[PDB]
């Protein structure tokens, strides 16, 4: 538990696109 | 099984962002 700002992301594995919004 | 270009997409609940890449 570091960072929490949103309970909704879309990080998939090794692509182009990670993280959360 | 229309279309299906990418195999990992990022549609979460009712938020302001639902798709694939």
Redesign the interface.
């Known amino acids: 538990g570091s960072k929490k700002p949103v309970p ?3 990080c ?2 090794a ?3 990670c993280q959360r ?1």
Chains 1, 2 share one sequence.
């Open positions: 909704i992301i879309y998939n594995a692509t182009g696109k919004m």
